[PDB]
Amino acid sequence: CPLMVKVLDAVRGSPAINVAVHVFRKAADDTWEPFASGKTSESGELHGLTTEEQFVEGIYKVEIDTKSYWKALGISPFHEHAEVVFTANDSGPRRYTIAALLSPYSYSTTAVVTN
Amino acid sequence: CPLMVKVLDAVRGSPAINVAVHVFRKAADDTWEPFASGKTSESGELHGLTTEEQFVEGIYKVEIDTKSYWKALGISPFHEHAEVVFTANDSGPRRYTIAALLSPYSYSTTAVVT
Amino acid sequence: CPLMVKVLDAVRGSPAINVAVHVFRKAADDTWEPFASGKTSESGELHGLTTEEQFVEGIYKVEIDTKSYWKALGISPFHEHAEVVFTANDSGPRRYTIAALLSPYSYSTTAVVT
Amino acid sequence: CPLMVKVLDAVRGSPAINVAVHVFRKAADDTWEPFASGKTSESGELHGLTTEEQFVEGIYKVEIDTKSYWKALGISPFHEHAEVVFTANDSGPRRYTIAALLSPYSYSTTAVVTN
Ligand SMILES: O=C(O)c1ccccc1Nc1ccccc1C(F)(F)F
Closest CA to D7 of D43, D36, D38: D43
Phi-psi map region of D89: left, alpha, beta (phi>0 left; psi -120 to 50 alpha): left
Q: Which amino acid is at A30?
A: D
The order of strands in the sheet holding A32-39 is A32-39, A20-26, A58-64, A79-88, B79-88, B58-64, B20-26, B32-39
Chain B, nearest residue to C15 by Cα: B112
Q: Choose the closest CB to C85 out of D80, D103, D109.
A: D80
In terms of DSSP H, where are the helices of B9-77? 66-72
Strands B14-15 and A20-26: unpaired
Q: Answer yes or no: do D14 and A113 touch at CB < 8 A.
A: yes
Strand ranges (E), chain D: 3-9, 14-15, 20-26, 32-39, 45-46, 58-64, 79-88, 95-103, 106-114
A108 CB near a chain B CB, below 8 Å? yes
Q: Answer yes or no: do C106 and D109 touch at CB < 8 A.
A: yes
Q: Answer yes or no: do D103 and B11 touch at CB < 8 A.
A: yes
Rg of chain D taking only CA atoms, in angstroms: 14
Question: How far apart are alpha carbons D8 and B101 in whole angstroms?
Answer: 16
- Annotated binding residues of C for L-thyroxine, written as ranges, equal 6, 45, 108
D17 CB near a chain B CB, below 8 Å? no
Ligand 1 atom closest to C101 (CA): 20
Question: How far apart are alpha carbons D31 and D84 in whole angstroms?
Answer: 16
Domain count for chain C: 1
Q: Which of D11, D110, D114, D115 to mutate to test the interface with A (most CBs of A within 10 A)?
A: D110
HSE-CB for A101 with a 13 A CA cutoff: 30
Resolution in A: 1.9
CATH number of residue D90's parent domain: 2.60.40.180
Question: How far apart are alpha carbons A92 and A106 in whole angstroms?
Answer: 33
Q: Which residues pair with residue B8 across a beta bridge?
A: B15, B101
CA of B101 to the centre of ligand 1 (A): 7
Residues 6+ apart with CB under 8 A from D35: D23, D24, D25, D50, D60
Residues recorded for chain A:
115
CA of A54 to the centre of ligand 1 (A): 39
Question: How far apart are alpha carbons B84 and A83 in whole angstroms?
Answer: 8
Q: What is the DSSP letter of A44?
A: S
C11 CB near a chain B CB, below 8 Å? no
CA of C100 to the centre of ligand 1 (A): 7
Domain limits for position D20 = 1-115
Residues 6+ apart with CB under 8 A from C54: none
> Which contiguous run of DSSP H or E holds residue A63?
strand A58-64
